Amino acid sequence: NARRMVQMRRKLEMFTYVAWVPRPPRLCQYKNASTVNFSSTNITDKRDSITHVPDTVKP
Amino acid sequence: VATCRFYTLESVTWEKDSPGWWWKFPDALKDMGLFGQNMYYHYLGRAGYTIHVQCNASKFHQGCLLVVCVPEAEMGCSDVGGTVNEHAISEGEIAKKFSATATNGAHTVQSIVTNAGMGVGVGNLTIYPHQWVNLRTNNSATIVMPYINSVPMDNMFRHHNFTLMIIPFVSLDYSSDASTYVPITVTVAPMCAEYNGLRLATSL
Amino acid sequence: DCGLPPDVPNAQPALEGRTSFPEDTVITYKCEESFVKIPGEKDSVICLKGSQWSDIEEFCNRSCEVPTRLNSASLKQPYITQNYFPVGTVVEYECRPGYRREPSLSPKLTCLQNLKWSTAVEFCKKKSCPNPGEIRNGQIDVPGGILFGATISFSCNTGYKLFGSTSSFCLISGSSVQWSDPLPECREIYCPAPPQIDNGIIQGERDHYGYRQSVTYACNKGFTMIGEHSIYCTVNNDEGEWSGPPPECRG
Amino acid sequence: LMEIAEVDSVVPVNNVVGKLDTMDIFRIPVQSGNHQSTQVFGFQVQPGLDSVFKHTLLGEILNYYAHWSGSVKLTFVFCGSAMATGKFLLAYSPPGANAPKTRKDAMLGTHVIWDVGLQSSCVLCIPWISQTHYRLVHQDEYTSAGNVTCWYQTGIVVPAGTPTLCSIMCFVSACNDFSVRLLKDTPFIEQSALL
Ligand SMILES: CCCCCCCCCCCCC/C=C/[C@H](O)[C@H](N)CO
């Protein structure tokens, strides 16, 4: 089974059948190979505010 | 004509704080007249579906829903070490409710809406067939789902072909004295239903 | 004195260890294994004058065992007190508490010719408890159904504490079955006080902070912020705790 | 895979503190009143590196590749009441200058003025304006792609009995000229031991 090393598993699970019926890439960390069990994962990483774009042109 | 017809499930209440709901199919129709009966007496089944979701509200209500059908929505357990009960995936005509926080318990699904019970980004569910119900724009969503599986036919009890999810990205909101009860109603119709393996009815 | 009592097919006399019997002795016979005595018949002889026993006819015959114990149904009167069940005997059952009749099925068993009872069908089916419902901000674990004798358990989502019963059982309640305990309540957990910081403030501090709610810090004029601009309430094992240290405001 | 990338996916623009595990991560807050001076939202065009985009369908696909090229579609949908009307200025500012601090500065770049009506969505297409044919997914200042900002063009006007606070959602997809290369492993999945 291709479910114990995480990279190839995540690559293959981008499709439902192998390709047919693409799926949203696994966001959470894999826990075991028997299941799809996961700990609840943040949607993304935080930034300072909703308008936050850091200055890159400065002396 | 006896199975390929619209069946209406129990409606759900869209509140200001409602993570969402989901239903697995065909389990959601295991009691819909002769469609369910044919399911009990046959070993194989194959049908498309026309899913119609209804949510009507005034122009002074604001809200948005995601209606998405997920083929092979293998859910995950809140306890990372363990399995799920059929009851934790589907209550039949009754909907399973997502949560706004992490869930605990034995054999229950990790139903935090952000991960959609599948360890994926909820915002990425648009890859599946989907529609949105924006109260300012529309009041119904229609999806035509053919039979999707890795085999021509399969048992309708042992396998959930697809899961229907309704997830409000924009919470329902209204004003002082507008209607507070805004329900969501789901209507599903099988299409081109076939059955094989006729024998005595199974018992759950 | 009489000699040995007469032989009776499928019956054995109680001799009590002797072989010569004084006049008027009454000897009783008991049926052998897999035989039942026939009601209304003599089971004993008596030593008459002239050293002669009275006549006795066969009084033993056949039958099925006592019907096996069913968890769903119990034998009705008078079958529940009976032990003689010859071939063709039909008994009747009634549902035990927790079960109710399946009307399309017969609650009767027949003793067959091979001395066994006929095939058991579920003429009494489990009595079911009501829908357990739902717990706001919590979950109901139903691991094996909601029928008579079932167990369900309750929990609360992250950031909520359970108040009330943690489990409930489908038990018999008079004429029906009901849940032992009502649904509990999941109340939001409140974090400790967000710590004030030197030379900075909390922006619009609130009275109570619950799960994932955030406290935003701001430094006073002339002071430089070092650290997270805000912190938020985490909740584990029903206890709240801030996500980390507040920022520093250094001059 | 580009078929997948061309599908709209909701963008956690409001990736602020605390709301990283809510649905509100996908909602940009707007409201009625005099709030023109207040910017609505702003982020860098880093489809595979910035926290705003790296976990979307487009971002996840890109993280398997080292180079990307092509235009990006940003679709914004107004999710308020049908009785609420407003106009917004969605601007894309190529790199070389700091992000705008006012509507006047942002208007000088590539922008579209969005009118809210029966059509609830508008598309701000980010053109491919690059000195190189490809950009790094792990973007640096050399491969910077610019920024996107939104400002109240007029504001939001609502009648009596209507909610005063509304929300906007942003979807991201790839145009038909989008392309990636240099397959690589993604840094969003890791383990410490055989599962
Ligand atoms: C002489 C030694 C021969 C070694 C054979 C090793 C592989 C034999 C079975 C290959 C079949 C598995 C192919 C991979 C598919 C995956 O496991 C999943 N089913 C697809 O997601």
Numbering used by the authors:
A (entry chain A): 96 to 113, 247 to 287
B (entry chain B): 58 to 261
C (entry chain E): 35 to 285
D (entry chain C): 43 to 237
How do the authors describe this structure?
Echoviruses, for which there are currently no approved vaccines or drugs, are responsible for a range of human diseases, for example echovirus 11 (E11) is a major cause of serious neonatal morbidity and mortality. Decay-accelerating factor (DAF, also known as CD55) is an attachment receptor for E11. The capsid consists of 60 identical protomers arranged with icosahedral symmetry and each protomer is composed of four capsid proteins, VP1–4, derived from the P1 polyprotein. DAF is one of the regulators of the complement system, inhibiting formation of the complement convertases in both the classical and alternative pathways.
In order to improve the density and characterize the interaction, symmetry expansion and selection of DAF occupied sites by variability analysis was performed. This analysis also indicated that the average number of DAF molecules bound per particle was ~20 and improved the density allowing, where there were contacts with the virus, some larger side chain orientations to be determined. SCRs 3 and 4 of DAF interact with E11 at the southern rim of the canyon via the VP2 EF and VP3 BC loops. We also observe an unexpected interaction between the N-linked glycan (residue 95 of DAF) and the VP2 BC loop of E11. The density for the glycan is not well enough defined to describe the interaction in detail, however it is clear that the BC loop of VP2 of E11 is involved, centered on Lys73. In the E6 pose, SCRs 2, 3 and 4 of one DAF molecule and two protomers of the capsid are involved in the interaction whilst in the E11 pose, only SCRs 3 and 4 and one protomer are directly involved, with the glycan of SCR1 interacting with a second protomeric unit. In support of this, it has been reported that a single amino acid substitution G162E in VP2 caused the loss of E11 affinity to DAF. Our structure confirms that a longer side chain at this position would clash with DAF in the E11 pose, so VP2 162 is a key residue controlling DAF binding pose.
